[PDB]
Amino acid sequence: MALSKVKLNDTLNKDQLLSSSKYTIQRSTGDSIDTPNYDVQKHINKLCGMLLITEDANHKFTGLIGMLYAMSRLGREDTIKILRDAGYHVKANGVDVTTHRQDINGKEMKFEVLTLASLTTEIQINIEIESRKSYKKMLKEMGEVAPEYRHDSPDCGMIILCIAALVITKLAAGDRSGLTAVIRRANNVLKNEMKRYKGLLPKDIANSFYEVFEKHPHFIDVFVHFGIAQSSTRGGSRVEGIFAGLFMNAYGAGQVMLRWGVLAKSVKNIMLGHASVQAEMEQVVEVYEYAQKLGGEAGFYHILNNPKASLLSLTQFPHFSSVVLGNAAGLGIMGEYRGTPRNQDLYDAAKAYAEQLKENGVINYSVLDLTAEEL
Amino acid sequence: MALSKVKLNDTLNKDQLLSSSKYTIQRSTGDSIDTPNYDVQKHINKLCGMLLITEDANHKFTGLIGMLYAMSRLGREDTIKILRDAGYHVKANGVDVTTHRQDINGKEMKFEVLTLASLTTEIQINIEIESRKSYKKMLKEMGEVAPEYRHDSPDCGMIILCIAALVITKLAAGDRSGLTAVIRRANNVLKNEMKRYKGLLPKDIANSFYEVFEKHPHFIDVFVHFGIAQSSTRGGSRVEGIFAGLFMNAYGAGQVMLRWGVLAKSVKNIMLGHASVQAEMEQVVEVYEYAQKLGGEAGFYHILNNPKASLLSLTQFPHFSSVVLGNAAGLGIMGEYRGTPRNQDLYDAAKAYAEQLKENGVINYSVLDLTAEEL
RNA sequence: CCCCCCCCCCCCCCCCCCCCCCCCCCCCCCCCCCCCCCCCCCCCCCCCCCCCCCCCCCCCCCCCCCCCCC
């Protein structure tokens, strides 16, 4: 009564503080940023395809080029708007298509290029040159190139942005450690696409995206909001359906510990009753309700580096964290997860009880009632 | 009390996120799209009939031509409006009827053709040429062609869109695997129509529609909304009544697992009481209520590739999925369904109990009460 | 008719306060796993069948009200 009413709400107080700032910072991203408009979108897709048909393609620029497609889907105005909302000063760079004349192999030739701050009109033609090589070879092998194999396929842009989504998936750890997991999934999920494109090398493109995200961290914001806008969509090609699916696997990255909590509660893991865990409960509810209040935007807080994500940490509660992680251990869901319990005794006990849980399913008859049962 | 209040609502949080995007993407469909207006509709229907009276007809273009009829029913303005709503930039292409003069067999002839981006005025006349051949042969066989046998019949357009609807039915799996099922149904349901049209070859047209949907995936959106607008209708010919019926068989494709859930609950399958299934319940209700909240539009989420459809998956709950699928097994409704239980022990137990359920119907007397019963 | 007695009120004491006392002080970023989805089957309907039918206006008597006292 007396003392049981004394508490301090820290998790929600902190949100309230960061939510109600009366002033703002603004960052100076760099000297330029290219904001391709809707009108350029088809050409960027075409360029993406050129990379995908190129066998053993150099994927250095592919990360950056993917970002360009995504921005050309958002559109010049929408893309700037999302940059400004994030708070960065934007030197917007208009993107037009111009023809370039250059003699390759002696003979003078025409090329379709983009005016880009980020991409030399030199390294652009080099992608188209290399693509043609892998294309005439492709034409020699099958006599006639099918539409699913060409750089025209409307899927090309989105196909590249698929391994981008997979990169976002594992971006929670912040380092390149997700890479092998990214490849693995790209191989099962995307196996059909990899059959139609010799240049769909997961390792390489995944590295190129990691690269662009690490280097230009504002793009990670841009991409997240693109994916959201792409998943808002009413219908779409199976590839866009794949993209959206993969993109959404990243919702709630960094907060795995949170879901394994709901699990511990769901399976009624005994070690949740422990006195020293019960002591933490008052606050552990505070954070779960804060997660609830936050809603949808919250899932991506860890992928973008949103300071407010620190608040969802269950790390601050060692006893609870430990039994939750032990529960997940004993149910064989963790590993090769690199989280450590701060309480070995609790972790072990939770693991032990969890392991015993899968052994006996007891039928509970009071969930569904029947007025006459012979059995 | 304490811990039982802690939960995270993930299914609804995710919807909330995709519903409330502040930005949008837009796709560049291709170079052109033909948007036939109401005024051309009768001519397209006529062209459809020409294909239907042609014995052993080449159905390569029939898929695309069907889409044109549907668009000519929606009307130029309504059809563009649905494309823009889906988010695609539209190069609208006006469709006029012009006369073409060409010498076939030496003699010069007139033809009624459409100005179409998608269809050469060459391959158009070829359908009318082939139709005439099968028509004069038809005239020779029965002396005089009845109105139900000609290419004039107002049904022709809608008849073709019938196997289109059937293609939508099985589009849930995404591949051509529905094809044999599509044929089967076209044969029972449409047997009367197949009698009046030698050119109503299900396999061929079904393949042509699969073709157009796979190739131009925006058409699948257009067709879905056409069918909705066609089923909104107040009255109509028996064929339009067949179309609507078939079209609506596709409502809830991809969500069969969901209906088999409601079934498991309905038959009071015992394995729903199991501890490890009860553990999932809290969340499995979340998704069913999300389905409820979504309402009508939800049924087609899987057919169009609407990212939000991933959310209706009961896959995320292995224990529940397994007993639901086992229940459906034991009641002999699954197969040749290619879904797999993630819990063999539960699936087997549910199947076993389900098989035992059909054996004994016990009369429950407390649903209807009577103040005096001698028996 | 109503009405009819008596009758001002008040009257003491009293400022209030007065002590002690800043506060603070440790630790600690976070994160880390796996995983697209989907896949069966199925148009709907289908019987019988207009309705209605009788009787039947309503009404009818008695009667102003009031009247004392103060």
Side-chain angles (χ1 to χ4, degrees):
Chain A
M1 44 166 100
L3 70 294
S4 59
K5 111 136 82 160
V6 16
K7 63 203 181 167
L8 189 22
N9 193 332
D10 264 345
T11 342
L12 204 123
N13 270 355
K14 283 192 208 170
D15 182 63
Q16 190 253 294
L17 174 65
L18 302 187
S19 292
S20 62
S21 176
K22 309 103 151 206
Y23 324 99
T24 35
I25 55 106
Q26 283 181 60
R27 301 168 273 203
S28 300
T29 80
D31 286 48
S32 303
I33 262 179
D34 320 85
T35 43
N37 208 6
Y38 303 104
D39 55 4
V40 179
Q41 184 190 112
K42 258 152 105 184
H43 185 258
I44 293 166
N45 177 65
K46 192 196 166 204
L47 199 102
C48 271
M50 303 195 218
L51 278 160
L52 290 162
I53 60 157
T54 305
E55 199 189 323
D56 281 328
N58 183 350
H59 279 301
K60 163 174 261 177
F61 301 102
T62 314
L64 186 266
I65 289 166
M67 274 311 93
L68 284 174
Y69 188 64
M71 277 180 284
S72 79
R73 278 204 160 204
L74 286 190
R76 172 187 162 80
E77 264 203 320
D78 259 320
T79 168
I80 288 160
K81 195 164 140 48
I82 117 167
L83 261 337
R84 281 206 214 274
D85 280 358
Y88 314 59
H89 269 263
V90 276
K91 181 66 176 187
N93 193 29
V95 184
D96 292 309
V97 198
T98 51
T99 320
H100 189 93
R101 298 197 170 186
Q102 190 172 308
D103 8 52
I104 271 81
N105 260 341
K107 339 141 198 286
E108 196 186 315
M109 309 206 63
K110 290 182 194 194
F111 286 114
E112 293 291 69
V113 293
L114 297 169
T115 50
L116 295 160
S118 46
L119 228 59
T120 349
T121 66
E122 325 307 305
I123 84 102
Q124 277 192 58
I125 66 140
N126 281 324
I127 299 174
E128 190 165 354
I129 290 163
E130 288 312 304
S131 81
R132 284 183 205 178
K133 287 180 192 178
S134 276
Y135 181 95
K136 57 137 277 162
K137 180 196 172 180
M138 199 157 61
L139 194 67
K140 201 171 188 175
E141 273 168 5
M142 42 196 284
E144 185 194 33
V145 271
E148 326 92 44
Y149 294 102
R150 55 180 61 262
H151 57 100
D152 286 338
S153 182
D155 301 309
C156 289
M158 290 307 296
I159 289 179
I160 286 172
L161 293 174
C162 273
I163 65 268
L166 282 174
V167 168
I168 263 44
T169 292
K170 297 279 109 80
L171 245 192
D175 52 323
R176 304 268 178 118
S177 75
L179 182 51
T180 55
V182 169
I183 293 159
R184 191 201 315 113
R185 292 194 63 203
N187 284 152
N188 319 308
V189 158
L190 228 47
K191 75 171 172 299
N192 191 76
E193 287 56 47
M194 295 186 68
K195 278 182 183 174
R196 32 194 291 244
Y197 297 100
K198 311 164 173 191
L200 207 176
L201 293 76
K203 193 187 91 177
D204 285 13
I205 312 168
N207 263 327
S208 188
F209 273 118
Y210 269 117
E211 180 75 47
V212 70
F213 290 137
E214 288 165 24
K215 199 178 152 84
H216 299 53
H218 52 250
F219 281 145
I220 118 92
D221 195 312
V222 173
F223 177 72
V224 165
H225 287 92
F226 159 80
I228 277 157
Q230 173 69 48
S231 305
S232 303
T233 197
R234 190 175 72 178
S237 72
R238 72 169 299 262
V239 178
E240 298 173 285
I242 289 172
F243 169 86
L246 289 180
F247 180 75
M248 290 309 293
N249 291 147
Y251 175 101
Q255 348 193 308
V256 61
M257 201 53 63
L258 225 40
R259 276 89 206 179
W260 285 345
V262 199
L263 180 59
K265 167 252 178 160
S266 287
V267 293
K268 289 159 201 151
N269 194 301
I270 261 315
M271 294 320 286
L272 262 25
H274 190 278
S276 77
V277 168
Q278 278 302 121
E280 293 178 342
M281 279 308 175
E282 202 219 326
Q283 291 102 252
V284 319
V285 179
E286 274 178 15
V287 40
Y288 268 100
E289 287 187 326
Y290 173 58
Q292 293 167 222
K293 169 226 142 97
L294 270 178
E297 85 199 54
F300 276 88
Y301 270 15
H302 275 93
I303 302 79
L304 321 145
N305 259 258
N306 196 320
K308 301 153 94 163
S310 269
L311 280 156
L312 296 142
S313 144
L314 278 183
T315 306
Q316 31 181 357
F317 318 104
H319 305 307
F320 186 82
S321 272
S322 297
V323 46
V324 159
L325 207 261
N327 172 63
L331 268 38
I333 4 154
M334 77 157 286
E336 225 291 315
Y337 182 62
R338 279 170 310 189
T340 323
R342 288 172 192 270
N343 194 317
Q344 200 60 47
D345 308 292
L346 274 165
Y347 169 84
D348 285 329
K351 182 207 190 79
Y353 185 82
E355 276 163 359
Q356 282 196 11
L357 264 171
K358 43 180 62 183
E359 251 43 44
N360 20 282
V362 184
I363 325 289
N364 182 21
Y365 302 107
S366 58
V367 207
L368 20 27
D369 44 27
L370 310 69
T371 14
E373 335 95 316
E374 269 86 313
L375 330 148
Chain B
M1 43 168 99
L3 71 293
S4 58
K5 109 137 81 162
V6 17
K7 61 204 181 167
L8 189 23
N9 192 332
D10 264 345
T11 343
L12 204 122
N13 270 353
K14 284 192 208 168
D15 181 61
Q16 189 254 295
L17 174 63
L18 302 186
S19 292
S20 63
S21 176
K22 308 102 152 205
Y23 324 100
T24 35
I25 55 106
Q26 284 181 59
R27 301 170 271 203
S28 299
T29 81
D31 285 48
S32 304
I33 261 179
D34 320 85
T35 43
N37 209 8
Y38 302 103
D39 56 3
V40 179
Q41 183 190 110
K42 259 152 108 183
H43 185 258
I44 293 167
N45 175 66
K46 192 197 164 204
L47 200 101
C48 272
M50 302 192 214
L51 278 158
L52 290 162
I53 61 157
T54 307
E55 198 188 323
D56 281 328
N58 182 351
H59 279 302
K60 162 175 262 175
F61 301 103
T62 314
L64 185 266
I65 290 164
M67 275 311 95
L68 284 175
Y69 188 65
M71 277 182 283
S72 81
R73 280 206 160 204
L74 288 189
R76 174 185 160 80
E77 264 203 321
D78 260 321
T79 169
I80 288 160
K81 196 162 139 50
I82 119 169
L83 263 336
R84 281 207 214 272
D85 280 358
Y88 313 59
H89 269 263
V90 275
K91 181 66 171 181
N93 193 28
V95 184
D96 292 312
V97 197
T98 52
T99 320
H100 190 94
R101 298 197 171 185
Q102 190 172 309
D103 8 50
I104 272 81
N105 260 341
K107 339 141 199 286
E108 195 185 314
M109 309 205 66
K110 288 183 195 194
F111 287 113
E112 293 291 71
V113 294
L114 296 171
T115 51
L116 294 159
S118 45
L119 228 59
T120 349
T121 65
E122 324 306 304
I123 84 102
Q124 278 193 57
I125 66 141
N126 281 324
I127 300 173
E128 189 166 354
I129 290 164
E130 289 311 304
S131 80
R132 283 182 205 180
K133 287 182 190 177
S134 276
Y135 181 95
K136 58 136 277 164
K137 180 196 172 180
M138 200 156 63
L139 194 66
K140 202 170 183 174
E141 273 168 6
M142 42 195 289
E144 185 194 31
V145 271
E148 326 91 45
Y149 294 103
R150 56 179 62 262
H151 56 100
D152 288 338
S153 181
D155 303 309
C156 290
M158 291 306 299
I159 291 178
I160 284 172
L161 292 173
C162 273
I163 66 269
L166 284 173
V167 167
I168 262 43
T169 293
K170 297 279 109 78
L171 245 193
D175 52 324
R176 304 267 178 118
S177 72
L179 180 50
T180 54
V182 170
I183 292 160
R184 192 202 314 113
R185 293 194 64 203
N187 283 151
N188 318 307
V189 157
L190 228 48
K191 76 172 171 298
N192 191 77
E193 286 57 48
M194 296 185 70
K195 278 181 183 175
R196 30 194 294 243
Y197 297 101
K198 310 166 175 189
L200 207 176
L201 291 76
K203 194 188 90 177
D204 283 12
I205 311 166
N207 263 328
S208 188
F209 273 117
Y210 270 116
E211 181 75 48
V212 72
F213 290 137
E214 289 165 23
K215 199 177 154 85
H216 299 53
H218 51 251
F219 281 143
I220 117 93
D221 195 312
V222 172
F223 176 72
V224 166
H225 287 92
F226 158 80
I228 278 157
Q230 174 68 50
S231 306
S232 303
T233 195
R234 190 175 72 180
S237 72
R238 72 169 299 264
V239 178
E240 298 173 285
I242 290 169
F243 169 87
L246 289 181
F247 180 76
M248 290 308 295
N249 291 146
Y251 176 101
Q255 349 194 306
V256 61
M257 201 52 65
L258 224 42
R259 277 90 205 180
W260 286 345
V262 200
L263 179 60
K265 167 252 178 161
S266 287
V267 294
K268 290 160 201 152
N269 193 301
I270 261 315
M271 293 319 286
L272 262 25
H274 190 278
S276 77
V277 168
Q278 278 302 121
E280 294 176 341
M281 279 310 175
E282 202 218 328
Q283 291 102 252
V284 320
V285 178
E286 275 178 14
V287 40
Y288 268 99
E289 287 187 325
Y290 172 59
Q292 292 166 223
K293 169 227 141 97
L294 271 177
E297 85 198 53
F300 277 87
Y301 270 15
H302 275 92
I303 301 80
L304 322 145
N305 259 258
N306 196 322
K308 299 152 95 165
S310 271
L311 279 157
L312 296 143
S313 145
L314 279 184
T315 306
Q316 32 181 356
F317 319 104
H319 304 308
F320 186 82
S321 271
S322 296
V323 45
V324 157
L325 207 260
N327 172 62
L331 268 37
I333 4 155
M334 77 157 287
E336 225 291 315
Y337 182 63
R338 279 170 311 187
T340 323
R342 289 172 191 270
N343 194 317
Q344 201 59 47
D345 308 292
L346 273 165
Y347 169 84
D348 285 328
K351 181 207 191 79
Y353 184 81
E355 275 163 0
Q356 282 196 10
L357 264 171
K358 43 180 62 183
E359 254 41 50
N360 20 282
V362 185
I363 325 289
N364 182 21
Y365 302 107
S366 57
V367 207
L368 20 27
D369 44 27
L370 310 69
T371 14
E373 335 94 315
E374 269 86 312
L375 330 148

